[model samples]
Target chain A: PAAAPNGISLPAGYKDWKMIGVSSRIEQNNLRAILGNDIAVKAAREGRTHPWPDGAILVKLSWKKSTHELFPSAEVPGDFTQADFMVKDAAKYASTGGWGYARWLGMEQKPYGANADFAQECMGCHSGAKAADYVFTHPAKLP
Target chain B: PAAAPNGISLPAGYKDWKMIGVSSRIEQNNLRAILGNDIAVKAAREGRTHPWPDGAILVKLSWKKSTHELFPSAEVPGDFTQADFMVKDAAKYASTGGWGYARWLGMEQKPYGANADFAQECMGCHSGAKAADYVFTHPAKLP
Candidate 1:
């Protein structure tokens, strides 16, 4: 994994790095679903109170959010809810000119969009791993 | 740099990581700009004659393909002016419904937009120092 004063090295082994290109318009459309109101502000706000069902969330997670003495935060009250929505920085994960916290949802594990306890569990993992404050990857660091 | 299987361990001197999330749609969009066209494929078929403004030639140097050129092939001609459209493997990079290569590009360097020569340039620098075959970074190996 590459690291720098302002960034980190490209994740790790890019030896077999393939040339994967995408369309700008196509990317723009994706913004609607991933960061749209439902998944964005809506999810964080209401999600704190409701546990995302296995079929509800397109993304999945291996663990749930760990709050102070909470089962799944969404199952409890107080800090976990505030922490998720009020962080003031949660929106950084959106694809609109910012970075994303995909690993937080443990999307890597969910091959078919099944839901799980990723918000708390996986987010905790990324919160412990990002660089330049707490970003998983940065386009500014590409060069 | 950390290189733990599955993911990696946090570096001893690194700061706290952040948790973020994005949709696979966004990932798909991001990959389009850099890998959409037959750029790498063109290079694989054409070889090193074409040079990007950045002063590099395309070369198939990946280990995943058993060192065999996956894109540039002698079956296709090198002339971009009179090239014919061939059937493409829409999901050539798609494995288990997941994408293989990431969609990204660099403008600071010349020959933008999936330039065959640019791919070579990418490989040239990455293959030598922190080489992952021709990649600069990945989760498997640390830079």
Candidate 2:
């Protein structure tokens, strides 16, 4: 019933957060915009993200692909799909390498999973990226 | 003294163009987003882009990196550095492999060169991608 099993509620004011980067997933057939709160943004912009600071929050907004009717040469976001989040707090999420994860699917943003066990799936996938602080998106470099 | 001596104007609604993909060039230390107009979008999305059809327009938006004041964890777009364009026209631009090239620089979007000869430099750089129709961006893959 909870939207975030890791005890993370939908973060406030994530919509206004500036974009860290955008990704197009071939496997998921979706587009994602990764955004960061002030804390996360400062670290990312500085390229100091090896150890994401506590209180930093990252949000991912995803959408299904669709064609733009007016601009036919472009594919725009079709349907609102899902939103995922990561909150960095070493003390609070010590067991999961200090990162708490959450996901909401569909436009309703229904939280995924019935309980905390869902975190194992997330942690497992991210473990492959252990070199990068158990996170996948590093926020691409800018000139 | 003309910015686009090739006779193309800064596209009327390019800022609204949907993104094809994001690219980071370490050599240039810049981030670039390749966007396509409707015709280019269809061709790119369909993977039908060996010889881009006429009327296809591609725009490259370039930005300098900047740090986020509030979210120090990430680097984001700092200054909008430049914009470059590739317009496809098999007959109209027959001598240039059917593509007309132009560039703009800085926040003001000032035209890149004083005359059309700059197209030669653009063509030279892109000629390496002749197999891809003299275009460097193929718009990455999507499911």
Top TM-score prediction, candidate number: 2
Local error of candidate 2 at residue B119 (angstroms)? 0.2
Fraction of real interface contacts that model 1 preserves: 0.07
Q: Individual DockQ of the candidates?
A: 0.03, 0.05
| Worst window of 10 by summed lDDT in candidate 1 chain B | B59-68
lDDT of 2 at B108: 60
Deviation (Å) of A57 in candidate 2: 17
DockQ of 1: 0.03
Model 2 regions lying over 4 Å from their true place:
A1-143, B1-3, B70-73
User: Looking at every candidate separately, what fraction of the true A–B Cα contacts under 8 Å does it contain?
Assistant: 0.07, 0.01
Please count the clashing residue pairs in each candidate, in the order shown. Answer: 39, 26
User: Residue A142 error for model 1, in Å?
Assistant: 6.0
